[PDB]
Amino acid sequence: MSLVYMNIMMAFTVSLTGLLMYRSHLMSSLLCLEGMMLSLFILATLMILNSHFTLASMMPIILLVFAACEAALGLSLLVMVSNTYGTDYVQNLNLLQC
Amino acid sequence: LLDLIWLETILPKTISLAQMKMSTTITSQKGLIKLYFLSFLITILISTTLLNFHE
Amino acid sequence: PFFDVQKKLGVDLDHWMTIQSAEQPHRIPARCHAFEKEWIECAHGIGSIRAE
Amino acid sequence: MMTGRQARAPLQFLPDEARSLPPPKLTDPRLAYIGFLGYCSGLIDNAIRRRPVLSAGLHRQFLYITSFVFVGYYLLKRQDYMYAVRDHDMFSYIKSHPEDFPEKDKKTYREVFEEFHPVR
Amino acid sequence: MNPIILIIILMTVMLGTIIVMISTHWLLIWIGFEMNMLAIIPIMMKKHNPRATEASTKYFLTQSTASMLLMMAIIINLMFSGQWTVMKLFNPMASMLMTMALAMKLGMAPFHFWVPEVTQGIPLSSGLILLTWQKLAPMSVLYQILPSINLDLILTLSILSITIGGWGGLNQTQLRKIMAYSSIAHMGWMTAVLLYNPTMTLLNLIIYIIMTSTMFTLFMANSTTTTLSLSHTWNKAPIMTILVLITLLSMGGLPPLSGFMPKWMIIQEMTKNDSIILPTLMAITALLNLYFYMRLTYSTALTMFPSTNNMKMKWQFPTTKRMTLLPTMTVLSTMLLPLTPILSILE
Amino acid sequence: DAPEKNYERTMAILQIESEKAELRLKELEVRRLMRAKGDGPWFQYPTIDKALIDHSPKATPDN
Amino acid sequence: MLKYIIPTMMLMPLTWLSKNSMIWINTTLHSLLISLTSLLLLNQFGDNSLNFSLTFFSDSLSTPLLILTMWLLPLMLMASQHHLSKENLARKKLFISMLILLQLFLIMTFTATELIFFYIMFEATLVPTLIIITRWGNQTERLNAGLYFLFYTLAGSLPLLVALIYIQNTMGSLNFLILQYWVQPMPNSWSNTFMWLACMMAFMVKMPLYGLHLWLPKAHVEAPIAGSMVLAAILLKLGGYGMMRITLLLNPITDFMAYPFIMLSLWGMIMTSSICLRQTDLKSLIAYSSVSHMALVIVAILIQTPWSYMGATALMIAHGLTSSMLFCLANSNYERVHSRTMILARGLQTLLPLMAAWWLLASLTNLALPPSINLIGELFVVMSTFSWSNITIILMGLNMVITALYSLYMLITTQRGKHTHHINNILPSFTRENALMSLHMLPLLLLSLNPKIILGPLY
Amino acid sequence: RDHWIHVLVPVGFVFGYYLDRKNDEKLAAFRNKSLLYKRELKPQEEVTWK
């Protein structure tokens, strides 16, 4: 298939493996999650514009909006973590081992 | 020797110690979100490259 | 559980965006309108096992 | 399994052809067991709230019995309907495909050789 | 929380799951999962302590990752099929990604690592919602895509879930983690029979929801979250020890109880398909689940652990908690096996 | 009971149970054939409804 | 069989609506009435079993076990009402309800026409027995004994579940009456080898097989007296009943699958009997003797000759009555000295002469004194195993030495010698206790007058 | 009745016995139809067993 889809899928996998390998910050995790969403937006958009499927042109906007609301919720969770420990470090979130 | 030790050793005590040991391996996690998602990425890589669950 | 509420009540919640060959605004066809119409009219009703 | 059968008429608890079937009796032992489950629910409801178990709230116990018999009657109707649909589809498929279901020639034991295994 | 806001948020959780159940477009499937997650996050942060925020953060990260993999599976389906019907998928890569995403949502092993944490971090009512209501929407999507699910993947996930949920509960004393590893094992049992007979998948889901709702309702009615506080129940309410006894013996699947009903039916559908090793090893692995159930019954019903003196004060007060449907759920989770051919209503 | 009663009651039992066993064997064979061929009413997994297709004259003719 | 199921279920409102001083008398009376009614099952024929319905049937194998089961409930109520006298009233009713529920599960375990219903009842009998052991047992090790009793049984029985569902899918049915006529020969393959193991190992655990018997000298010992009575007298015999039902389907592979297990019993009954020579615990001695007696039943079912099945079912009924009486004698001394150590209370014939006469009679039935049905079952098994292989008489006859040598040692250590000086709470024999001993021993002696009712479907 | 508890188990026998007789009429497909026991009915006889 087309050549641009290779790069958009590879971008989704790069943002996947960034989201699946945390370093320290939860904000960097949320950025990798939104990179995954952005690559999904681009890939859906290039397909729907290519196929001239008219009714799905409203589809990526929807894919934006919900997920950005999702991002808002994630930011709020991070802030609550930051209001407990002072930092958004993922190693502070280890109390549920016992 | 037999009906207090060895017939007691081979079927119930070895199985009970094995399930105890596997239970202590599974639940010895450090609560780190980093390690669980790193295991998820290793899972996806083993599933695609090593187990071929996408073919 | 596919509780088919849309066919039960006769409402159309999401069938319109489902396929490319559906009713489009300003009668804009998809680039693969004819192929998708032929595949759907082939595979209609006979089930997925026979449709493959 | 039968999900393509109940897909042209979806979300119908009892279809119209279910009215061709004999409904379960009110003295159905399955329905009497469901009424016994209602009575047990009434006794457990008195026990968990520390009421006298057999005496307190007979109206509540009777509504437990009535509600379980009421729901279980329709559940038994749908049960009998789904097994009727199962057998109807089976027999129509055996009738429409004779080449897959031939009549096996049944041989009497005068021809049928069985190997004797002596127990000694 | 404002009770009106609690009602609207629980109706939004239910609305998300119902939108997953009734929709014919994959975008509305993804929307129902997003609405479900977005609305269930305040249910987990109901008490506002750092364990609830940690649990909600872990829950958000796992469900968000699964939602992104779900949308990538949907988008690859749109690549290779040009449409959006919620039916079989038209690519084994999209099928693998959707099966992984739904395994992450259900918390099936090896994506199980959030389930005993999050259930520990949240209250008993929100844990009840997470272990009963949050299974319904991904099992509906798995119900509708089973002509495309890889057999080796779904059975690998099933046996890995059953074994890890068996060994995980043996080391626990916290009741919520016990119910979470019980969840992982039972989801393994549900997905092991999915490609063979999905009516038995629905049967196992319904009997599991009934038994889990009974055990969480007993834990809420007795206000016990640990084994050793559950062992004070005989000196406070002796009927509840009988109820946790019969319900835990049901959840292990001992006949003549109704929790023997699903797994037996599952074996009844796995030997028709010439699989004998797999349901036998599954049934032998479920003895571990029954072992820590028996541990809880020995702590609670069949012995009497020592109590404290202040228990004598609680003798003067009856339970004012609304024990909603507890006799009904207790009767249904124990005495339903003579009505086993009722399962045809799920066909 | 009489030996006649036990005898013929046994014969009724054997008829009912042998009929049920033959029906279970036919049920297994029917399930195997319908899953393999997809031509019966069972295992009818859904496809797209062709009543969703617009057949109107579109904006461009080559379709 | 519904004329026995419904009275057994009506024992539940009979015990939950009785007055607080009346729950032993009413249950004892009406369970004796059910046991009197149990004799109608002796309408047996030389060719046809008594086939009640699609669900229940009773041949001459299930019938003596049914009579023994329905007779054992009043005797358990008499044995268990003393040590539960200070028990709470509702827990007393829960104990009686578990015994009633166990009788209910057993009487439709033995009459189950279809084998998966046999399996459901057969494994339903675990739960009241488990609850009785772990709730009304006396010591700390009742919990571990309940775990062993549960988890040897389920590890045996879940492959039986898989194998019975396989027979259901292959033969089309699990009706035993259908499978008498549709049974296909089982050839030599590894698939049929594990078919045989899955069909047999559950009953091997429940008999118990030697090497798998480890649950029993805990579960029979840590239980209360009604638990030990129902475990020894009935619940071991579910294994032999299920073997005699299931080895119809396992021919001719059984003729070379039986060889290890036959060894495991023919040596194992030498071992456990030898173990009874050095048991300091009297109740454990009776437990190991139960293993020793059921090993002969295992051999007799595996060699599958008519004399062997007749001796096996005679020995099952005889051992039910004998081991139940032996546990009741051990409890009658435990209720006095409060220790199960056999060397503690000695010389009891000087103090309790009639109870020592009961000890003598139960010892003589334990060592298979003719013409008791213990000797009838013992002897027919020895005849059939001699016809199997002539050398086995050595392992039979040596067994019959050691079986005497622990039976009279149990008689000599407890009843004979000088009485213990520092023990002074040795009350005279209560009328309930002697009634219990007679209600065990007198049917066991009257069955020698007409033993043909306890000789199975092929007498 | 002052001793109504002593009829729970006996009537539970009789009722159970009744159901067994009621069961036998549902298993009468081969009544007087077996090859071993079939015969002609006597006068003032409508069934060969009940």
Place this chain on the structure above:
Amino acid sequence: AKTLLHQYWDIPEGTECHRKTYAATSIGGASGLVVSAYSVALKTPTSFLEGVARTGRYTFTAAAIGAIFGLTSCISAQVREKPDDPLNYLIGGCAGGLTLGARTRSYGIGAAACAYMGLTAALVKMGQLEGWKVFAEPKV
């Protein structure tokens, strides 16, 4: 890793010993790499060197189990002249169990791994013989 098991099972029993040994060694090495990957995933090693030491130790342990398993299986199938026989895999599985006990430096783990892994390898041989399916295809 489906092709690894194919190139194991394509060779007949007791015919080509070193290629069978290399195929079973590769299967053991793949299993050791999977166990090592989850081991350094869920339990963080204190260094890169300790992590690669754990990885090399587990990979060589399971590779030695597979090597001595396939070697002992093929040598027994050669010297007993019976290729279709599960006693050969019982011997090979006990040799692999003794290999696991030698790597764990203990006798009782070696005897337990002998018994259980030998019975498991015998079951795998019987499943190849009679066609037992663990992931059986949905047919009804």
